[PDB]
Design an enzyme around this catalytic site. Structure first.
Site, PDB file in Angstrom:
ATOM      1  N   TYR E  27       0.737  -1.266   0.000  1.00 54.63           N
ATOM      2  CA  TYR E  27       0.000   0.000   0.000  1.00 54.63           C
ATOM      3  C   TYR E  27       0.767   1.318   0.000  1.00 54.63           C
ATOM      4  O   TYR E  27       0.206   2.344  -0.365  1.00 54.63           O
ATOM      5  CB  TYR E  27      -0.986   0.021   1.171  1.00 54.63           C
ATOM      6  CG  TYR E  27      -2.072  -1.013   1.056  1.00 54.63           C
ATOM      7  CD1 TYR E  27      -1.896  -2.305   1.561  1.00 54.63           C
ATOM      8  CD2 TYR E  27      -3.264  -0.720   0.400  1.00 54.63           C
ATOM      9  CE1 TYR E  27      -2.890  -3.279   1.414  1.00 54.63           C
ATOM     10  CE2 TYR E  27      -4.258  -1.678   0.246  1.00 54.63           C
ATOM     11  CZ  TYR E  27      -4.067  -2.953   0.754  1.00 54.63           C
ATOM     12  OH  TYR E  27      -5.066  -3.887   0.615  1.00 54.63           O
ATOM     13  N   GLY E  29       2.199   3.826  -1.541  1.00 55.77           N
ATOM     14  CA  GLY E  29       2.376   4.334  -2.887  1.00 55.77           C
ATOM     15  C   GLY E  29       1.208   3.962  -3.773  1.00 55.77           C
ATOM     16  O   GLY E  29       0.372   3.138  -3.404  1.00 55.77           O
ATOM     17  N   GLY E  31      -1.877   2.989  -5.964  1.00 52.44           N
ATOM     18  CA  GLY E  31      -2.628   1.750  -5.878  1.00 52.44           C
ATOM     19  C   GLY E  31      -2.480   1.054  -4.540  1.00 52.44           C
ATOM     20  O   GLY E  31      -1.798   1.545  -3.639  1.00 52.44           O
ATOM     21  N   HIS E  47      -3.780   5.493   5.465  1.00 48.43           N
ATOM     22  CA  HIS E  47      -3.564   6.827   4.917  1.00 48.43           C
ATOM     23  C   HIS E  47      -4.406   7.034   3.649  1.00 48.43           C
ATOM     24  O   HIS E  47      -5.051   8.074   3.480  1.00 48.43           O
ATOM     25  CB  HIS E  47      -2.081   7.048   4.611  1.00 48.43           C
ATOM     26  CG  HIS E  47      -1.762   8.440   4.161  1.00 48.43           C
ATOM     27  ND1 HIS E  47      -1.579   8.774   2.835  1.00 48.43           N
ATOM     28  CD2 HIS E  47      -1.618   9.591   4.861  1.00 48.43           C
ATOM     29  CE1 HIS E  47      -1.336  10.068   2.740  1.00 48.43           C
ATOM     30  NE2 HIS E  47      -1.355  10.588   3.953  1.00 48.43           N
ATOM     31  N   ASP E  48      -4.405   6.042   2.766  1.00 46.25           N
ATOM     32  CA  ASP E  48      -5.188   6.141   1.544  1.00 46.25           C
ATOM     33  C   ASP E  48      -6.675   6.180   1.883  1.00 46.25           C
ATOM     34  O   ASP E  48      -7.443   6.927   1.275  1.00 46.25           O
ATOM     35  CB  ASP E  48      -4.884   4.967   0.612  1.00 46.25           C
ATOM     36  CG  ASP E  48      -5.751   4.984  -0.639  1.00 46.25           C
ATOM     37  OD1 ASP E  48      -6.810   4.331  -0.642  1.00 46.25           O
ATOM     38  OD2 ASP E  48      -5.381   5.669  -1.610  1.00 46.25           O
ATOM     39  N   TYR E  51      -7.541   9.638   3.122  1.00 44.55           N
ATOM     40  CA  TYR E  51      -7.648  10.595   2.020  1.00 44.55           C
ATOM     41  C   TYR E  51      -8.977  10.374   1.301  1.00 44.55           C
ATOM     42  O   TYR E  51      -9.656  11.327   0.921  1.00 44.55           O
ATOM     43  CB  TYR E  51      -6.497  10.392   1.024  1.00 44.55           C
ATOM     44  CG  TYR E  51      -5.263  11.228   1.290  1.00 44.55           C
ATOM     45  CD1 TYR E  51      -4.997  11.740   2.561  1.00 44.55           C
ATOM     46  CD2 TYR E  51      -4.346  11.488   0.270  1.00 44.55           C
ATOM     47  CE1 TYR E  51      -3.847  12.492   2.813  1.00 44.55           C
ATOM     48  CE2 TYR E  51      -3.185  12.239   0.510  1.00 44.55           C
ATOM     49  CZ  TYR E  51      -2.942  12.736   1.781  1.00 44.55           C
ATOM     50  OH  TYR E  51      -1.796  13.465   2.026  1.00 44.55           O
ATOM     51  N   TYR E  64      -2.355  22.905   4.046  1.00 47.47           N
ATOM     52  CA  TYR E  64      -2.806  23.157   5.413  1.00 47.47           C
ATOM     53  C   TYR E  64      -1.681  23.757   6.255  1.00 47.47           C
ATOM     54  O   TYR E  64      -0.552  23.896   5.787  1.00 47.47           O
ATOM     55  CB  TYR E  64      -3.290  21.849   6.053  1.00 47.47           C
ATOM     56  CG  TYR E  64      -2.285  20.721   5.965  1.00 47.47           C
ATOM     57  CD1 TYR E  64      -1.107  20.742   6.716  1.00 47.47           C
ATOM     58  CD2 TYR E  64      -2.497  19.640   5.104  1.00 47.47           C
ATOM     59  CE1 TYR E  64      -0.157  19.709   6.609  1.00 47.47           C
ATOM     60  CE2 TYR E  64      -1.561  18.607   4.992  1.00 47.47           C
ATOM     61  CZ  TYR E  64      -0.395  18.648   5.744  1.00 47.47           C
ATOM     62  OH  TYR E  64       0.535  17.638   5.620  1.00 47.47           O
ATOM     63  N   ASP E  89      -2.012  12.861   7.401  1.00 52.38           N
ATOM     64  CA  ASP E  89      -0.565  12.951   7.238  1.00 52.38           C
ATOM     65  C   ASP E  89       0.213  12.794   8.546  1.00 52.38           C
ATOM     66  O   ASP E  89       1.198  12.052   8.600  1.00 52.38           O
ATOM     67  CB  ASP E  89      -0.192  14.287   6.591  1.00 52.38           C
ATOM     68  CG  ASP E  89      -0.628  14.386   5.132  1.00 52.38           C
ATOM     69  OD1 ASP E  89      -1.213  13.415   4.600  1.00 52.38           O
ATOM     70  OD2 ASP E  89      -0.378  15.447   4.518  1.00 52.38           O
TER      71      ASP E  89
END
Ligand code: TRT
Ligand code: TRT
Ligand code: TRT
Ligand code: TRT
Ligand code: TRT
Ligand code: TRT
Ligand code: CA
Ligand code: CA
Ligand code: CA
Ligand code: CA
Ligand code: CA
Ligand code: CA
Lengths: 122, 122, 122, 122, 122, 122
Positions: E27, E29, E31, E47-48, E51, E64, E89
Site C-alpha cells: 500500500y 504508494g 494503488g 492513509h489512503d 484521504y 494546510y 498525514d
C-alpha cells in the site's frame, strides 16, 4: 539521430556505454568549453566540431542509414548532410572504443572550474 | 512565471509550441552565449536581457496578471517588476509569432561549437 | 557523493533545503561563470573550486564517511581525496547555513545575462 | 497517437488542459476500475475500452490524420484502425469539452480507495 | 499537500526518508490491494483510506497549516477538510517513525504477485 | 538488480531492447492481471512470480554475479537469494530472445481493458 549515435556507441562498447560519455571531461555532453582533458574528451571535441560544420540538416534529429558488419559500424546509402552526420557519429563511436583503455572515471561530471581554460577552436 | 510565458507562446502559436523554443539557436533555452543566429533567436536574446534588467523580483517564478483579447496577449493590472516581467514575456511571445515564418528547424538543439562567437552584450 | 552533500545541507537547514541551492546566483548549480552575486553564491564558487582541486577521485561520485554530532557536520575517518571531498562539502554546507539570513530568492534560476561578467579565477 | 490526443484536448480546452486528465477520477489515466465519478470519468472508461477494441495497430503509437475546422475536431482520411483510433480520441476530447463545467478538481489524483467497486465490461 | 506530508516524514525520520515509503509493501504508494505486509504497510492502507474520506478538497493538493514542536508534528488552525488532511498525514508520519525498527527493506518495490489477496474495506 | 536484468536483455537482443518490455502485454512491467497475450507476456507473469518467491533479499535491488559466455547468459557463484534472483532474470531474458519473432508491437502499452480476466496463481 542522437538515438542512433547512442546505438553505435552501445553496439561498440556494450549496453548503456553511452552513459559513460554523457558528461565526461570538458566536451563530452551538454555544451563544451576549455581544453580537452584527454583522448576520449578530444573525441567529443572533434564530434562537436563535426556537427558544427553540418548545414542543411539537424545533426541531433536527422535520421540516417547505417549498420553493423561483423562488429563494425557502417554508414550506408547517405547523401549530403545525412552522409556527413553519420560520418560524424561513426568516427566518434570508434574513437571512444579506440580510447576505452584510457577512460578516466574521475572525469565523469567534471567540475566546472576545470574547464575554465581558453576554448580551443574547431 | 515561466508557465505563464509558455501559456502566451502556446496561446499565440498553438499547443506545445513552447517546445520549439526550448533549445533553439544560441539563446533560446538554458543559458545563452555567442551571437543570435536569426530573428527568432534574437527574440530570445532580447528576452534574456529583459529578464537580466528586472530587479526586486524573480522573473521565472513571479506570477503576474495577463489575458488574451481576441487572440492577442494583454498584460493586465501590473505594477513594478511584475509589470516589467509580463512585458518581457508578452514581447517575446509576439516576437516568436512574428518570426514564425523564418523558424529554422536546423537550429533546434544547435551544436555548442556554433555559438563560440563573442557574446553580444545586452 | 552529491547525495551526501545534499544530506549535509538538509541536515543543516531542513528537509529539501538542497533545492534552494540548485540553480542560485551564478555558481550554485550546473556550471558556473561570471562573478558571485552574494555570500551564498560565493559559497558555491568556493565549493566549485574546492572540487576543481581534487585529484585521484571523483568528487561527485566518491563516497566518504561523515556524521552529525549535535547538529554539526563531522567528517570522519577520511584519507587523501576522500578527506578533501568531505571537507569541500562540509565547508559549503556550513557556509550556506551561515549565510541563510541573506539568501535572496530573486537569485533562484538567475538570468544568464546577469553572469556575463569576467569569470573570477579560483 | 497520444500526442495527437493531447493536441485535440488542448485545442479544445486550451494549453496544458491534457494535464487535467492525467490522473482524474477512476479512469482518466493508467489503469481503471470502480465506478466512474462523473461524465468526464465515464468518457475515460470508454476511451480505454475504445482503444481496447482496436486490432492491427497500436492505438497509443499509431499516427492518424486529423485537423481543426472552425474550432471543431475532424478526423481525416483514415482507413482501418487509424480511423477508429482518431474517433476514440475525437469523441473523448469532445466529451471533456462538453463536460468542462462539471469537471471537479477534487477528483484529481483520486485515492485508490474510491475506485474499488466492481468494474463494468466494455 | 503531498510535499507537506514528505516534510513531516523527513522531519521525523531524516532527509530523504519519504523515499523509503514511495513503493513499499502493498500500500505505500500508488494503488493498493492485498494483505498489508507489516505495521508500516497497514498505515499506508489507512492513509489512503483517510484521504478517500475527504470531501470538498483535494487531499494531495490542498495546503494546510502545521509545524514541529520539540520534534513532534502539530497540525495548526485548520478547519473542515484541511484539518482532516493534516491529521491523515500526521498520523501516517508518526506511524512510520513508530515502526522504523520493523521497516523491512525487502518489501521495497514489492512484486505485485504478493499483493493479490482480497482487500479490506476502509 | 533490475539494471543487471536490463543488461541481460540488451546483451541478448541489442541496445535498448529492455524498453520493448517496459509496458508490454498484461504483465511486462508494473502490476499485472488478466490473461497473458503471448509467450513473452507469460514469461513476464512468471518473472514477477519468481521475484515474489524470493525471501531474505530485495530481488529488484540485490546485486548478483553473472556474465556472458559465447552469447549465452551465465549466473555466477551466487548463494541463497542471489542465485534465485539471477535465475529469474536469466530465464526471463532468454525467453524474450526465444520469442522475439512473435513479439507483437501492438501489445506495447496495452489498454487496461484487455487485462481484466481472472488472474492465475503463481
Ligand atoms: C560539446 O558537446 C558535444 C557532445 O558530446 C559528444 C558525446 O555524446 C555522448 C552522449 O550523447 C548522447 C546520446 C544520446 C542522448 C539521448 C538523450 C538522445 C538518449 C539516451 C537517454 C537514451 C542516452 C543524449 C546524449
Ligand atoms: C538565454 O536564455 C533565455 C531564455 O530563452 C527564452 C525562450 O524560452 C522558451 C522556453 O521557455 C520555457 C518555458 C517554460 C518552461 C517550463 C519548465 C516552466 C514548463 C514546460 C516544461 C511545460 C515547457 C521552461 C522553459
Ligand atoms: C559551479 O557549480 C558548483 C556547484 O554548486 C554547489 C551547490 O550545489 C548545490 C546542489 O548540489 C546538488 C546536490 C545533489 C544533487 C542530486 C542530483 C545528486 C540529488 C537530488 C535531486 C536529490 C537533490 C544535485 C545537485
Ligand atoms: C491510459 O489512459 C486511460 C484513459 O484515459 C484517457 C484520458 O487520457 C488523458 C490524456 O492522456 C495522456 C497521457 C500522456 C501523454 C503524453 C505522455 C504522451 C504527453 C504529455 C506529457 C505532453 C501530456 C498524452 C496524453
Ligand atoms: C498514493 O499513496 C498511497 C498511500 O501511501 C502513503 C505513503 O506515501 C509515501 C509518500 O508519498 C509521496 C509520493 C510523492 C511525493 C512527491 C512527488 C510530491 C515529492 C517528492 C519527489 C519530493 C518525494 C511526496 C510523497
Ligand atoms: C515489474 O516487472 C514485472 C515483470 O516484468 C518483467 C519485464 O521487465 C522488463 C524490464 O524491466 C525494467 C524496468 C525498469 C528498469 C530501470 C528503471 C532500472 C532501468 C532503465 C531505465 C535503464 C530501463 C530496468 C528493467
Ligand atoms: Ca499546450
Ligand atoms: Ca460515454
Ligand atoms: Ca529531504
Ligand atoms: Ca493503523
Ligand atoms: Ca543499451
Ligand atoms: Ca513460462
Amino acid at each position: 539521430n542522437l538515438f542512433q549515435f547512442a546505438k553505435m556507441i552501445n553496439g561498440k562498447l556494450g549496453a548503456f556505454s553511452v552513459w559513460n560519455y554523457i558528461s565526461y571531461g570538458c566536451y563530452c555532453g551538454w555544451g563544451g568549453q576549455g581544453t580537452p582533458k584527454d583522448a576520449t574528451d578530444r573525441c567529443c571535441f572533434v564530434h562537436d566540431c563535426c556537427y558544427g560544420r553540418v548545414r542543411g540538416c539537424n545533426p541531433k534529429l536527422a535520421i540516417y542509414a547505417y549498420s553493423f558488419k561483423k562488429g563494425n559500424i557502417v554508414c550506408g546509402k547517405n547523401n549530403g548532410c545525412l552522409r556527413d552526420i553519420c560520418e560524424c557519429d561513426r568516427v566518434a563511436a570508434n574513437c571512444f572504443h579506440q580510447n576505452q583503455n584510457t577512460y578516466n572515471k574521475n572525469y565523469k561530471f567534471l567540475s566546472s572550474s576545470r574547464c575554465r581554460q581558453t576554448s580551443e577552436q574547431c
